[PDB]
Amino acid sequence: PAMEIECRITGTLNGVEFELVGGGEGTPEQGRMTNKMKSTKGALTFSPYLLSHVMFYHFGTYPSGYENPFLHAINNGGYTNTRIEKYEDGGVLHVSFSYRYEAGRVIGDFKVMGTGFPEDSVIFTDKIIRSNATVEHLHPMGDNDLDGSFTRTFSLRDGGYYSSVVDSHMHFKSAIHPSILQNGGPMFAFRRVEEDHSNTELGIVEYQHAFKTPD
Amino acid sequence: LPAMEIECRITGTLNGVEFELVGGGEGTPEQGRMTNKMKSTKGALTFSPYLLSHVMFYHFGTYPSGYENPFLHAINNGGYTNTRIEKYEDGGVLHVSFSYRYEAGRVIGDFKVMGTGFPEDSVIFTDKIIRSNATVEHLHPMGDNDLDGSFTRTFSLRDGGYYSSVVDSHMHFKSAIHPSILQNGGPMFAFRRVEEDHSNTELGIVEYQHAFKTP
Amino acid sequence: AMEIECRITGTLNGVEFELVGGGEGTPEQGRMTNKMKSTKGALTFSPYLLSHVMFYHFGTYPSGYENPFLHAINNGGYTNTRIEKYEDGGVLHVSFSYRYEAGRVIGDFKVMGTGFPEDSVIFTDKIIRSNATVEHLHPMGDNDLDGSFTRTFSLRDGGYYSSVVDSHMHFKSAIHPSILQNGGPMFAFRRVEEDHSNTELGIVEYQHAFKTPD
Amino acid sequence: AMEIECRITGTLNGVEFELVGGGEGTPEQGRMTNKMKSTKGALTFSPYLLSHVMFYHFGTYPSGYENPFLHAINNGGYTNTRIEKYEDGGVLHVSFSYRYEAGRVIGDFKVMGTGFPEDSVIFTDKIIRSNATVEHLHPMGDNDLDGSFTRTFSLRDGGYYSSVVDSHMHFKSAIHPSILQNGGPMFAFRRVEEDHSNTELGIVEYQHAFKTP
């Protein structure tokens, strides 16, 4: 039985307010989740592709012998994620993720502040056609904190790319699952999305698979 | 002019721990001087109060003859926002957003801080910081409504050393920036220094700000 | 298989070093070896700092793709320039150049490291091994790839020493079309097996590129 | 005045360049000049990219302070290494080394630029001048200074191209006590007057350090 997902995203991009609400479902054992959300303030003023990675690390597979620490945290006080994303044209996206849990349900309430995107930014065009896959390097900073880092790109219609560098800080109320904490080497997290967006209605399917070594 | 009154609220989280301070002071832009004294409403801070000195109003800086402080100028024409990303040498990050409201003779600042990624052994969780040192910010426009700022900032440590950060700021103006900033003649520099009188519950600053084209 | 010859010359905080040696590798196995000896006595810093300086030609690529570094051998070659920023402020600038002879790759590599503090873990015996990495690679135009990865070393006491690496690879001819026509990144997993003293350094490195980890 | 001799060798996106020349400077006036000629033909990128590679010795310091770069001439000197990150992704790594004789400084500088995209403004004639900067300098222990600054260029049709520069200066002996005993940063204001073609480059540079402006 897939876990239900509810989600709200609220924020500002270059000072323009936006808000989306929606949900989907996910099966952590398959590393799969879906999320569909709709704007509550009319059309977005920027590319909906910017929000794909804002639209739940709980739904990722982990290798034999390791436990998804985000899933583990559900029963032991949870975690928050805070990401700082620096785009190649100077835009900055700051995102904070907080969660609550009910029986068979995760509810996310996410806050986004994007600033410094130039007027000529690709995010104010329909040039972005998709988000590309990423592999995040995760390692513990201490018993209650994981540090994540990855490079992310979008593909553009004329064949180019738009890139960012992402740094993430995951803070856990209780100690991180011992399989992750005691590893003595990083864990990698591969992620990819399938996006079906308009300017008012956004939808993703995401796959997340953590690994020590690729096949 | 009589000094402008200042009212200030700072709300935020540092590595998940909530804090809030409220207070105020006053400032005289023609002197480049302002004061702000604030008290924590959530008991003693869990980190060095010096970390908040540069969060505790660019309106109060002098500008050279032939130029006008664009922050001061914005008061009567829709105002501005400031958003800063500060990267500390031990990996901690502060994201700070500044919002303002104005009255005759008064500015009211409501500021939001998110600090994450500071390691347990960070100098900020000790009493080692003894003062904030002076800075010179490089300011230059991106089009008529946006300024970018950047500076390196250091703190002095009890033991004689330094703790450093790099700060990048984006200011977005509702109306065109004062034209003295927009003539394609290069950046404006803003020298700032503070005198700090802090405890872990009561913080106080006198700040001086002086902009210049040449020293 | 190909023979490997290698020279590394550099300075760390101004102190000159030079290593010389070589090995061999089998691109189809994604495997290479390199053993090098210092020519200026013992290194003044941890030999593990040089493991990732001691040949992208020797990486496997997924079915349908060709290793572009390997491809470049018969088409003008490539250079790599990396800037590595360590969590203590140290910076390593490394540039890699290659020549090719029959059955052989010769690398001549230049390293300039600066700003490592006196208390740097590099001036101790705390580093015990390099950890695995996954590099994100994507084309910046037809003749250049951009790479980025986070790298950590494991420390004796259980901790990590971290860096961020950005790489620019410039090709004299167009990058192999399987990589240019790919329309997203290629990921390069690397791991190294190190057997170092302060004068004699040895690695076995495995390199495996992938689009997806399953 | 002190005579200056200078060579700059490097590559940008792979393409080798070399310039040689020199000038003179007067430290008490914070002024120096340098004119250099390309020896590998016309440059393939904007000559304004090289103005800040074309001698910290020639800056003024406030009353009671000594220029630590000038002072180091007699006790082993210093090296400077800079990493410059441009807003379009290009990177310049620049290393500076110096040799001294009576009345002369000789600089031999190495530049490696990589990662500038084919559409970069550096491959056009859009840059028309380098703008002024203020470097933040502070010590890391007795033998090392760290520098940081933002630098902009002005463009023909208005607006700016920007970079961030981080520098590491390493001294053979301890930095002058007036700099180490300062208890906070020193600021170094610099500006340049440029007269460049793609084969012949020339600068006049002024440098003035201060604790407060």
| Alpha-carbon distances, residue B148 vs B62, B144, C159 (angstroms) | 19, 12, 37
Half-sphere exposure of D154 (CA within 13 A, CB side): 17
The domain spans of chain A are: 1-215
Q: Which residue type, as a one-letter code, is found at position C135?
A: E
Going by C-alpha positions, the residue among B50, B1, B55 that lies closest to residue B26 is: B1
Query: What is the C-alpha to C-alpha distance for residues A159 and A153, in angstroms, rounded to an integer?
Result: 12
DSSP string computed for A97-159:
EEEEEETTEEEEEEEEEEE---TT-GGGSS-EEEEPPEEEEEEEEETTEEEEEEEEEEEETTS
Question: From the candidates A130, A151, A209, A211, which should be mutated to test the interface with C, based on the most C CB atoms within 10 A?
Answer: A151
Which of D154, D164, D184 lies closest to B186 in CB terms?
A: D154
C15-26 and C31-38 beta bridge pairing: antiparallel
Cβ distance B153 to B53 under 8 Å? no
Query: What is the C-alpha to C-alpha distance for residues A170 and A159, in angstroms, rounded to an integer?
Result: 34
Query: What is the C-alpha to C-alpha distance for residues B169 and B171, in angstroms, rounded to an integer?
Result: 7
Q: CB-based contacts of D102: which residues, under 8 Å, 6+ apart?
A: none
Cβ distance A156 to A122 under 8 Å? yes
Interface check for A62 against chain C (CB to CB < 8 A): the answer is: no
Query: What is the C-alpha to C-alpha distance for residues C187 and A211, in angstroms, rounded to an integer?
Result: 13
Cβ distance A131 to A52 under 8 Å? yes
Query: What is the C-alpha to C-alpha distance for residues D173 and A117, in angstroms, rounded to an integer?
Result: 46
Q: CB-based contacts of A51: which residues, under 8 Å, 6+ apart?
A: A9, A20, A44, A112, A202
Q: Reduced to 3 states, what is the DSSP secondary structure of residue B142? A: coil
Tell the burial category of C134 from Cβ atoms under 10 Å away from its Cβ (0-12, 13-18, 19+): buried
Tallying the residues shown for chain B, one arrives at 215
Query: What is the C-alpha to C-alpha distance for residues B176 and B77, in angstroms, rounded to an integer?
Result: 9
Cβ distance C38 to C15 under 8 Å? no
Tokens 């470097």 belong to residue: D135
C104-114 and C2-12 beta bridge pairing: parallel
Query: What is the C-alpha to C-alpha distance for residues B139 and B150, in angstroms, rounded to an integer?
Result: 7
Query: What is the C-alpha to C-alpha distance for residues D52 and D135, in angstroms, rounded to an integer?
Result: 13
Interface check for B16 against chain A (CB to CB < 8 A): the answer is: yes
Q: CB-based contacts of B120: which residues, under 8 Å, 6+ apart?
A: A142
Query: What is the C-alpha to C-alpha distance for residues C195 and B209, in angstroms, rounded to an integer?
Result: 56
CATH of domain D1-213: 2.40.155.10
Interface check for D140 against chain C (CB to CB < 8 A): the answer is: yes
Local structure of residue A169 (DSSP, 8 states): E
**Radius of gyration of the CA atoms of chain A, in A:** 17
Name the phi and psi angles at A167, rounded to 5: -125, 140
Closest Cα of chain B to A170: distance in Å? 8
Residues on chain A touching B15 (C-beta within 8 angstroms) = 145, 171
| Alpha-carbon distances, residue C128 vs A29, A174, C46 (angstroms) | 35, 29, 10
Tell the burial category of B2 from Cβ atoms under 10 Å away from its Cβ (0-12, 13-18, 19+): exposed
Resolution (Å) of this entry = 1.6
Q: At CA B178, angle to CA B177 and CA B180, rounded to 5?
A: 125
Query: What is the C-alpha to C-alpha distance for residues B178 and B170, in angstroms, rounded to an integer?
Result: 16
Between the two ends of chain B, the Cα-to-Cα distance in Å is 26
Closest Cα of chain C to A99: distance in Å? 28
Query: What is the C-alpha to C-alpha distance for residues B98 and B66, in angstroms, rounded to an integer?
Result: 28
Local structure of residue C134 (DSSP, 8 states): E
Half-sphere exposure of B64 (CA within 13 A, CB side): 13
Query: What is the C-alpha to C-alpha distance for residues B52 and B132, in angstroms, rounded to an integer?
Result: 10
Tokens 């409504």 belong to residue: B145
Reading phi first (left if > 0) and then psi (alpha if -120 to 50, else beta), residue C212 is in: beta
Residues D213, B210: C-beta atoms closer than 8 Å: yes
Cβ distance C166 to C135 under 8 Å? no
Query: What is the C-alpha to C-alpha distance for residues A141 and D55, in angstroms, rounded to an integer?
Result: 42
Going by C-alpha positions, the residue among B196, B186, B211, B136 that lies closest to residue D137 is: B136
**Radius of gyration of the CA atoms of chain D, in A:** 17
- What's the token pair of residue A93? 């996206």
B162-173 and B135-141 beta bridge pairing: unpaired
Tokens 């800056």 belong to residue: D59
Q: Reduced to 3 states, what is the DSSP secondary structure of residue C195? A: coil
Query: What is the C-alpha to C-alpha distance for residues A185 and A176, in angstroms, rounded to an integer?
Result: 15
- What's the token pair of residue C83? 């800037």
Name the phi and psi angles at A61, rounded to 5: -80, 150
Question: From the candidates B116, B120, B167, B170, which should be mutated to test the interface with A, based on the most A CB atoms within 10 A?
Answer: B116
Q: Reduced to 3 states, what is the DSSP secondary structure of residue B73? A: helix
- What's the token pair of residue A170? 């995951």
Closest Cα of chain D to C29: distance in Å? 30
Interface check for D114 against chain C (CB to CB < 8 A): the answer is: yes
Q: What is the number of other CB atoms lying within 10 angstroms of the CB of residue A130?
A: 19
Going by C-alpha positions, the residue among B127, B121, B78 that lies closest to residue B102 is: B78
| Alpha-carbon distances, residue D182 vs A145, B129, B161, D137 (angstroms) | 38, 17, 12, 11
Residues on chain D touching C95 (C-beta within 8 angstroms) = 112
Tokens 């460049």 belong to residue: D196
Residues on chain A touching C136 (C-beta within 8 angstroms) = 134-135, 150-151, 153
Q: Which residue type, as a one-letter code, is found at position D4?
A: I
- What's the token pair of residue D195? 């007269």
CATH 2.40.155.10 correct for C1-214:
yes
Cβ distance C36 to C21 under 8 Å? yes
Cβ distance B82 to B55 under 8 Å? no
Residues closing a segment before a gap in chain C (C–N exceeding 2.5 Å): 54
Q: CB-based contacts of A55: which residues, under 8 Å, 6+ apart?
A: A7, A9, A20, A35, A37, A202, A204
Q: CB-based contacts of B205: which residues, under 8 Å, 6+ apart?
A: B35, B36, B37, B53, B56, B194, B195, B196, B197
Q: Reduced to 3 states, what is the DSSP secondary structure of residue B41? A: coil
Q: Chains touching chain A at 3 or more Cβ pairs under 8 angstroms?
A: B, C
| Alpha-carbon distances, residue A56 vs A80, A87, B59, C148, D23 (angstroms) | 11, 22, 41, 25, 62
Interface check for C142 against chain A (CB to CB < 8 A): the answer is: no
Which residues share a beta bridge with B3? none
| Alpha-carbon distances, residue C26 vs A51, C1, C58, C195, D126 (angstroms) | 43, 4, 6, 20, 48
Query: What is the C-alpha to C-alpha distance for residues C4 and C204, in angstroms, rounded to an integer?
Result: 12
Name the phi and psi angles at C52, rounded to 5: -85, 0
Going by C-alpha positions, the residue among C210, C211, C199 that lies closest to residue C36 is: C199
Residues on chain A touching B83 (C-beta within 8 angstroms) = 92, 113, 115-116
Query: What is the C-alpha to C-alpha distance for residues C196 and C52, in angstroms, rounded to an integer?
Result: 13
Going by C-alpha positions, the residue among B106, B83, B110 that lies closest to residue B94 is: B83
Local structure of residue B124 (DSSP, 8 states): G
| Alpha-carbon distances, residue A2 vs A9, A31, A73, A206, D35 (angstroms) | 22, 11, 18, 14, 72
Closest Cα of chain D to C112: distance in Å? 9
- What's the token pair of residue B67? 């130029």
- CA C136, chain centre distance (Å): 14
Tallying the residues shown for chain A, one arrives at 215
Query: What is the C-alpha to C-alpha distance for residues D204 and B109, in angstroms, rounded to an integer?
Result: 45
CATH of domain A1-215: 2.40.155.10
Q: Reduced to 3 states, what is the DSSP secondary structure of residue A29? A: helix
Nearest residue of chain D to residue B189 (CA atoms): D134
Q: Chains touching chain B at 3 or more Cβ pairs under 8 angstroms?
A: A, D
Going by C-alpha positions, the residue among B83, B111, B94 that lies closest to residue B165 is: B94
Q: Reduced to 3 states, what is the DSSP secondary structure of residue B76? A: helix
Closest Cα of chain B to D156: distance in Å? 10
In D54-78, which positions are buried (b, 16+ CB within 10 angstroms) versus exposed (e)? bbbbbbbbeeebebbbbbbeeeebb
Residues on chain B touching A84 (C-beta within 8 angstroms) = 85, 93, 95
3-state SS string over chain D?
CEEEEEEEEEEECCEEEEEEEEEEEEHHHCEEEEEEEECCCCCCCCHHHHCCCCCHHHCECCCCCCCHHHHHHHCCCEEEEEEEEECCCCEEEEEEEEEEECCEEEEEEEEEEECCCCCCHHHCCCEEEECCEEEEEEECCCCEEEEEEEEEEEECCCCEEEEEEEEEEEECCCCCHHHHCCCCCEEEEEEEEECCCCCEEEEEEEEEEECCC
Query: What is the C-alpha to C-alpha distance for residues C112 and C94, in angstroms, rounded to an integer?
Result: 7
Cβ distance C144 to C115 under 8 Å? no
Query: What is the C-alpha to C-alpha distance for residues C180 and C72, in angstroms, rounded to an integer?
Result: 13
C160-171 and C186-194 beta bridge pairing: unpaired
In D149-184, which positions are buried (b, 16+ CB within 10 angstroms) versus exposed (e)? bbbbbbbeeeebbbbbbbbbbbbeeebbebbbeeeb
Nearest residue of chain D to residue B142 (CA atoms): D159
Going by C-alpha positions, the residue among C40, C83, C62 that lies closest to residue C169 is: C83
Half-sphere exposure of D119 (CA within 13 A, CB side): 5
Query: What is the C-alpha to C-alpha distance for residues B208 and B27, in angstroms, rounded to an integer?
Result: 10
Q: Reduced to 3 states, what is the DSSP secondary structure of residue C106? A: strand
Residues B134, D164: C-beta atoms closer than 8 Å: no
Local structure of residue C83 (DSSP, 8 states): E
Local structure of residue A61 (DSSP, 8 states): B
Cβ distance D132 to D150 under 8 Å? no
Q: Reduced to 3 states, what is the DSSP secondary structure of residue B179? A: helix
Cβ distance C35 to C8 under 8 Å? no
What's the maximum distance between 2 C-alpha atoms anywhere in chain A? Answer: 49
Name the phi and psi angles at A128, rounded to 5: -70, 125
- What's the token pair of residue A29? 């054992």
Residues on chain A touching B114 (C-beta within 8 angstroms) = 82, 94, 96
| Alpha-carbon distances, residue C12 vs A200, A213, B106, C128, D169 (angstroms) | 55, 32, 55, 20, 13
Query: What is the C-alpha to C-alpha distance for residues C148 and C152, in angstroms, rounded to an integer?
Result: 14
Query: What is the C-alpha to C-alpha distance for residues D98 and D106, in angstroms, rounded to an integer?
Result: 6
Residues on chain B touching A94 (C-beta within 8 angstroms) = 85, 95, 114
